[PDB]
Amino acid sequence: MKAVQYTEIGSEPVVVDIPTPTPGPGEILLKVTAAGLCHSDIFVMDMPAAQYAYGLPLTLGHEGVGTVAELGEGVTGFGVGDAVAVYGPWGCGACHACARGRENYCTRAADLGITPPGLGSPGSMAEYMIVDSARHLVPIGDLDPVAAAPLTDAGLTPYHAISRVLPLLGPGSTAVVIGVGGLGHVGIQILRAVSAARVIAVDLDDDRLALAREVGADAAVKSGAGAADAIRELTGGQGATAVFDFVGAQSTIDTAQQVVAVDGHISVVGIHAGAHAKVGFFMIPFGASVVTPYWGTRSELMEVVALARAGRLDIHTETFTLDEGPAAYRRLREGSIRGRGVVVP
Amino acid sequence: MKAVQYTEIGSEPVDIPTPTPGEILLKVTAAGLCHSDIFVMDMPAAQYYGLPLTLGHEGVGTVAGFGVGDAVAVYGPWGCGACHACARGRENYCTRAADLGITPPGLGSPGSMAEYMIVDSARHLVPIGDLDPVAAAPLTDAGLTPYHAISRVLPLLGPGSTAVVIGVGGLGHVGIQILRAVSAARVIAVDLDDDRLALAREVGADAAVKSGAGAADAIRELTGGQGATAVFDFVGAQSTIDTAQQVVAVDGHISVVGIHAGAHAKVGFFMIPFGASVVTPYWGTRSELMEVVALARAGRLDIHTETFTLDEGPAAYRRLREGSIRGRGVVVP
Amino acid sequence: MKAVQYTEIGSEPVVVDIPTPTPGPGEILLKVTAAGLCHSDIFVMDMPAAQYAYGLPLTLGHEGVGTVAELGEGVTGFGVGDAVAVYGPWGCGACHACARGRENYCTRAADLGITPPGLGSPGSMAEYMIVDSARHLVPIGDLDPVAAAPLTDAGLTPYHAISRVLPLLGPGSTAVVIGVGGLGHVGIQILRAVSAARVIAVDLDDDRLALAREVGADAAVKSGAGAADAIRELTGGGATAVFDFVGAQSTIDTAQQVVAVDGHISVVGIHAGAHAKVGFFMIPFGASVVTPYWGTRSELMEVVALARAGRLDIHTETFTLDEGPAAYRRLREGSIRGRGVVVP
Amino acid sequence: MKAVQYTEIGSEPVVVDIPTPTPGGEILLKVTAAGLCHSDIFVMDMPAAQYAYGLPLTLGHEGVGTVELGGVTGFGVGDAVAVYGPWGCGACHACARGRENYCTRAADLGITPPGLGSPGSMAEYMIVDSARHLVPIGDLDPVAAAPLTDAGLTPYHAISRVLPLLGPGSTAVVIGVGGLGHVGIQILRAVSAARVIAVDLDDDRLALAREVGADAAVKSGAGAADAIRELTGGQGATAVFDFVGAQSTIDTAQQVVAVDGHISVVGIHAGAHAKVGFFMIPFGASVVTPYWGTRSELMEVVALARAGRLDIHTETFTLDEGPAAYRRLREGSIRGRGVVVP
Ligand SMILES: NC(=O)c1ccc[n+]([C@@H]2O[C@H](COP(=O)([O-])OP(=O)(O)OC[C@H]3O[C@@H](n4cnc5c(N)ncnc54)[C@H](O)[C@@H]3O)[C@@H](O)[C@H]2O)c1
Ligand SMILES: NC(=O)c1ccc[n+]([C@@H]2O[C@H](COP(=O)([O-])OP(=O)(O)OC[C@H]3O[C@@H](n4cnc5c(N)ncnc54)[C@H](O)[C@@H]3O)[C@@H](O)[C@H]2O)c1
Ligand SMILES: NC(=O)c1ccc[n+]([C@@H]2O[C@H](COP(=O)([O-])OP(=O)(O)OC[C@H]3O[C@@H](n4cnc5c(N)ncnc54)[C@H](O)[C@@H]3O)[C@@H](O)[C@H]2O)c1
Ligand SMILES: NC(=O)c1ccc[n+]([C@@H]2O[C@H](COP(=O)([O-])OP(=O)(O)OC[C@H]3O[C@@H](n4cnc5c(N)ncnc54)[C@H](O)[C@@H]3O)[C@@H](O)[C@H]2O)c1
Ligand SMILES: [Zn+2]
Ligand SMILES: [Zn+2]
Ligand SMILES: [Zn+2]
Ligand SMILES: [Zn+2]
Ligand SMILES: [Zn+2]
Ligand SMILES: [Zn+2]
Ligand SMILES: [Zn+2]
Ligand SMILES: [Zn+2]
């Protein structure tokens, strides 16, 4: 069985040959149809030995879809060959958060060493993969696998981030999206679907701002030092109802604070080591909340899939063979994938 | 009338004419002194509203759709009344007030530490009935502000949740009571002073623990691993904020309510739990001030005052700075 | 001035000549640019004498848009010439509900004799009108007065009824809109602008079904006894929400027959004595039911914002003041394709 | 093992020796307590035509127990647990939020609750289908724990649905100070600042209501509507939770509710319905019939029980006393909940 795995700290990932797994009881085995590349995957492989805590080796890929190959003893509700998507942020299933589907915010996960596929558990970047538990499988009917893998993260996360504050984004509101990459271009679209918000996109790259318009953005602003003024220029004196920073570097967060509205929100979603928002009197408008959200909930994934199934999310992808796995990650690193990269086994 | 004023930046306070409507005018029955005034009066000429300035943003009074003689309370953060926020009574978050130059009484408009006062518009008065005005004055801010901050994340504080209250001061101690009125949350109080901790218990707290280095651990030892659903920090110093960050739960909330120039929560990955939101809330909303008055009228709020005469004004202030008033401080005309 | 008025119980409205009024202190006078005919008005004029409570004569029109012509003493906030829409459900201004802008749910209006323009207070079907207080005007800017007047009732009410349960209409949800006329056709577009909901519309009339399709419905089906099974056909076993802008027993019955578990019915349309039957074994578990009234201050602000954004496409027919009475007859007969709007 | 089943339509339940059951996936509990819900004195009144739950049926949908297992772990042997009644599919949109009481796939997949189409809790032992249907109760007294699964959960959910309305100044009306209603009163007080007015038919129930925190107490029947308005001023209750559900309690609820208020019809009277239409109910006042409660809502009730925020009035009975206990419930003589201890 072929797979892409991280094997040495600071080394590139490699194509490997390792056993097809079999499902224990309660487990499901998928024949992987599509596996998404997330930029988080990079942030991991950039960890130094001291910080890295995910086991070696690790089959990569926390964006995952496939078909049911083989059931472990006593699993019901699923038939061999039903098409499914994998809910990534696995949790204990039993705590107060888990009971509401919010397994991303599971209070027990850490203690019980429950880790997401691709992030401590064997990932989706192989021909087959195991899902621990049936409730982490979401039905996707005839949905194209290539366009669906991304929904599990590039979809789920922005959706979550938005769902946190969706009551604010009524008519008149303005939402700002910073970074039109994997999560970014999907962000915009989610915002058109479930809100009346005017959407303003922000990227460093001119072609990415075109992709932004392409997928629904009302206006498109060039990133950097002119950004905040251009945004206010667009929002009138008032500012942006919310800011979804899918970059999360210090400059984009600075821009976020410089633009957000009184009683608004900033979602620091993108990860830059040691970048923070500065929330104190005089540094931010009154009542403007700031959060770093994580992935997304059970019911939220089914909502994202519902969005795809309704033809409301036009996902941008590029396909790679398994052997082009390592190559796909040099491409995401250099920034040359216009959307999400996806590895079709 | 007499009217405790602030006429030279960096000093200490004081006899003005008596103003006229044509608008509403109230015989003041009480005036709260907020720590915010001490913040306003350590403001360099630069940073710093107008002088002369009649003090007091916490005001109740009696009128000197409203009966002459009505006992009423003054909604503080005035705004345009006409934006999206103001239409929802959320005038504390009004977008146009700055640009229209609309300032609260005792904060750019003539305040409550006079004997009579003007209130610009009829909507800024909340009927208090036969509630004792001394006890009511605080409601308007020491009640309003923490009520509003507790109102922003109320649905997270169902049974089994935990709320931490940092700074059992004028505001702190009303907040503790609020949490007990409107939630089933476990309340944990924190403070530097051992007498303030006792205050905390008297008004309902489920535990009160010493502020400092041992605070984070002591809090976690009562919450278990999870931490605290909501931290409301009424001190807002960097040390209190650091504590809050170290105890909050995943999917929790931090409300930075106290003001220390240059203190901030640092919100970013590794420095705060996932899903833990932070906000600096400001003052409160119209319907919120009614809700506060409703709690008082039901006997659900036991407000600790200490009365002052129109004259004892300036002395009343130095005691606040000194940390020597147990609860609020109220000036009566 | 020229105005249309209900002058005699059970008679038709007539065009009359009455003095142009003048703002009291606190008040605004408007030069009316547009006035909306609402079916509620017909309901009102159908009332028998005993029920009828709004005084005589009464100047019709509870949907109104104009420009500021005269400020009463003490009124700031507005400049003469400003374009404004009239918030209708006037309230006391001070009560717990009013302070949140929900003057439609004011608890003191009844007691105080505070009634809406055209529904106890002289309406907007005249050359000029009086609005009692400045908070009841909402700026419209350059918005076409003809497509703006319906926002005051025909937008505001659907917007509200939808607001009450919006967290229900996530991706995957379905909403039914029964009755694609004045409110109905606007209710469709709102659902599409502010929710991911799939939208099925329902009407007796085949032209109206097209209108629904034309303004965004994902589907459109014929009202009547066959209507439920066809809605169910579209959904599978049902409908997350039903907004019934007809509110007749037959439609309500359909409504209950198709609402999802933990869904909702908004009974918006008014048929005298028609009611939902909410009780065990007659409605799914969790399915809530409410008769909403009008909408809220911020709500109207928000509806106005939707128009300005170009997300609401309002279908209208224009009438002079004299065609007033003739336009009401057209409404009763059902020959207006959208909202009838009078331009003084 | 001994158990108390309904075996003959129209006939009182009976006590029987049947085999102790075995776990599949499943989990077996030594029932430490089994609550009696007036809902059963409904199911048994069902005519042979509408009754659809199978014969014979171990009665009892409020269970609390001690844990053998199924091949499924996460719970240890002898852990104390409460049982989530309204079983669902665990896979639909409602079930992913934990809202199994609103599971859509349950009637198709023919999934029924214990005591309600599946084997009950009124026995020495019981089967539980899946883990997620077990709630840790820790060291709580099982007699007081059992009513929480239903007499607790049902009112908590009914209240949860509209809690935001119930701020300081709000008024809540509880009709029917019985099993559900007297926990209803206490929940209202723990999680809100609403002023509680209880209504019942009999003085001793009105006593019970004050005993559990009711701000005020009303004699039910015609005079109620007026008596309630005398206490709300001419404004009426923000909320009315009707644990009785008869046309008259419902009627009363319409005549007292506030503009933009809520009526929750929780009691089951066969044919009784609210009449939601213009001129018959205030603008903006919502009605619903809610069903049981959610997984996270049961963790929330347990938490309330655990912090001494609830006092659950019960009378104990043994396995043999069961049948006679229902007669009690029917004639309405139990002060709170009847609970069974094997
Ligand atoms: N919060 C979560 O639960 C979670 C989940 C998934 C991803 N993430 C993080 O979100 C980030 C985005 O992920 P992705 O997979 O979409 O990466 P990506 O490579 O697809 O995104 C790159 C995009 O961001 C733009 N960009 C880079 N720097 C910018 C700048 N300073 N200003 C404006 N735009 C800039 C790029 O030009 C490009 O359009 C990553 O850091 C990832 O780790 C977090
Ligand atoms: N956010 C707003 O819109 C707004 C409105 C009003 C007041 N405030 C602010 O809230 C803060 C408190 O207000 P107050 O008037 O009740 O003050 P107060 O002086 O009456 O209360 C101070 C309390 O805090 C305690 N304290 C000081 N430092 C502490 C620390 N390190 N750890 C624990 N306890 C500590 C003191 O022992 C005392 O009990 C002030 O900074 C004030 O400006 C903010
Ligand atoms: N709830 C409120 O506060 C509020 C506010 C404004 C208007 N209304 C009421 O709402 C209702 C709608 O008013 P409008 O002005 O939009 O009416 P309208 O005359 O403009 O629209 C009538 C539409 O309903 C359709 N219709 C009639 N019977 C039908 C049936 N059995 N099935 C499907 N469609 C049917 C007609 O075909 C027509 O398209 C009226 O009853 C009006 O009085 C209520
Ligand atoms: N909605 C749900 O999912 C659900 C769940 C559980 C129970 N229930 C139903 O709720 C109801 C109450 O259950 P219970 O076991 O607590 O009943 P109970 O017998 O334990 O209590 C009944 C109480 O209501 C009082 N009462 C009777 N008629 C009255 C009236 N006219 N006005 C005021 N009070 C009156 C009685 O005196 C008694 O105090 C039942 O109908 C039951 O089936 C519904
Ligand atoms: Zn990722
Ligand atoms: Zn968990
Ligand atoms: Zn203050
Ligand atoms: Zn404003
Ligand atoms: Zn109307
Ligand atoms: Zn009012
Ligand atoms: Zn029951
Ligand atoms: Zn289900």
- DSSP annotation string for D294-324: -HHHHHHHHHHHHTT-----EEEE-TTTHHH
Cα B249 to its chain centre, rounded Å, is: 25
Distance D130 CA to ligand 6 centre (A): 16
Residues B272 and B302 in one domain: no
Neighbours of D149 (CB within 10 A): 30
Residues C144 and C21 in one domain: yes
The sign of the CA dihedral B302, B305, B310, B313 is negative
Angstrom distances, CA of residue C143 to CA of A19, B305, C312: 67, 54, 12
Q: Give chain B's domain count.
A: 2
Omega into C57 within 30° of 0, i.e. cis? yes
Q: Which residues contact D191 (CB under 8 A, 6 or more apart)?
A: B158, B159, B183, B184, D159, D163, D304
HSE-up (13 A, CA, CB side) for residue A306:
21
Q: How far apart are alpha carbons D180 and B24 in whole angstroms?
A: 51
Q: Residue B20 in 3-state DSSP?
A: coil
Residues D283 and D313 in one domain: no
Residue C23 tokens read as 């703002």
D touches which chains (3+ CB pairs under 8 A)? A, B, C
Q: Residue B262 in 3-state DSSP?
A: coil
Q: Residue B179 in 3-state DSSP?
A: helix
Residue A338 tokens read as 């216009």
Residues B141 and B287 in one domain: yes
Q: How far apart are alpha carbons A208 and A206 in whole angstroms?
A: 5
Q: Are strands C28-36 and C339-342 parallel, antiparallel or unpaired?
A: antiparallel
Q: Give the DSSP H or E segment for D179.
A: none
Q: Do B290 and C96 touch (CB under 8 A)?
A: yes
Q: How far apart are alpha carbons C290 and C259 in whole angstroms?
A: 13
Binding-site residues on chain B for chain A (CB distance < 8 A): 84-85, 90, 92-93, 95, 99, 152, 160, 225-226, 236, 241, 249-251, 256, 259, 261-272, 274-282
Residues B94 and B188 in one domain: no
Nearest to D185 by CA among D202, D167, D164, D200: D200
User: Does the C-beta of C295 come closer than 6 Å to ligand 3?
Assistant: no
Residue D59 tokens read as 């009665």
User: Does the C-beta of A39 come closer than 6 Å to ligand 1?
Assistant: yes
Q: What are phi and psi of B216, to 5 degrees?
A: -50, -55
Atom 41 (ligand 3) nearest CA:
C269
Q: Residue C33 in 3-state DSSP?
A: strand
CATH number at residue A224: 3.40.50.720
Q: How far apart are alpha carbons C66 and C85 in whole angstroms?
A: 7
Largest CA distance in chain A: 62
Q: How far apart are alpha carbons A181 and A203 in whole angstroms?
A: 9
Q: How far apart are alpha carbons B227 and B222 in whole angstroms?
A: 8
- Give the ligand whose atoms come closest to the C-alpha of residue C64: 9
Residues B94 and B5 in one domain: yes
Residues C103 and C198 in one domain: no
Q: What is the DSSP string of B77-134?
A: S---S-SHHHHTT-GGG-SSHHHHT---BTTTB--SSSSEEEES-GGGEEE-TT--HH
Q: Do B274 and A293 touch (CB under 8 A)?
A: yes
Residues near ligand 7 ion, CB 5 Å cutoff:
B 34, 36, 141
User: Does the C-beta of B240 come closer than 6 Å to ligand 2?
Assistant: yes
Residues D215 and D310 in one domain: no
Q: Provide the 8-state DSSP code for C201.
A: E
The b-or-e profile of B75-88 (16+ CB within 10 A means b, else e) is: bbbbbbbbbbbbbb
Residues B79 and B110 in one domain: yes
Residues C75 and C174 in one domain: no
Query: What experimental approach yielded this model?
Result: X-ray
Residue D240 assigned ligand-binding role: no
Residue B41 tokens read as 């009066």
Residue A295 assigned ligand-binding role: yes
Distance B196 CA to ligand 6 centre (A): 37
Neighbours of B143 (CB within 10 A): 32
Q: Environment class of residue B201 by beta-carbon count within 10 Å: exposed (0-12), middle (13-18) or buried (19+)? A: middle
- Judging contacts by C-beta atoms under 8 Å, the chain B residues touching residue C135 are 81-82, 87
Q: Provide the 8-state DSSP code for D341.
A: -
In chain A, DSSP assigns E strands to: 2-6, 14-17, 28-37, 58-59, 63-71, 83-86, 128-131, 137-139, 174-178, 198-203, 219-222, 240-245, 260-268, 277-279, 289-291, 317-320, 340-343
Residues D130 and D181 in one domain: no
- Judging contacts by C-beta atoms under 8 Å, the chain A residues touching residue C309 are 171, 196, 198
List chain B gaps (C–N > 2.5 A) by preceding residue.
Answer: 14, 22, 48, 64
Q: How far apart are alpha carbons C190 and B115 in whole angstroms?
A: 53
Angstrom distances, CA of residue C239 to CA of A5, A32, B6, D232: 46, 35, 64, 37
Q: How far apart are alpha carbons B118 and C289 in whole angstroms?
A: 46
Residues C152 and C57 in one domain: yes
Q: Which residue has the tokens 């503009």?
A: D259
* A78: region left, alpha or beta (phi > 0 left; psi from -120 to 50 alpha): beta
CATH number at residue D95: 3.90.180.10
- Judging contacts by C-beta atoms under 8 Å, the chain B residues touching residue C134 are 82
Instruction: Please answer whether residues C297 and C101 qualify as being in contact, where contact means their C-beta atoms are separated by less than 8 angstroms.
Output: yes
Nearest to B160 by CA among D295, A91, D301, D163: D301
Q: How far apart are alpha carbons A73 and A71 in whole angstroms?
A: 7
Q: Do C171 and A312 touch (CB under 8 A)?
A: yes
- According to DSSP, the residues that pair with B59 across neighbouring strands are B31
Domain limits for position C19: 1-157+294-344
Q: Do A194 and C193 touch (CB under 8 A)?
A: no
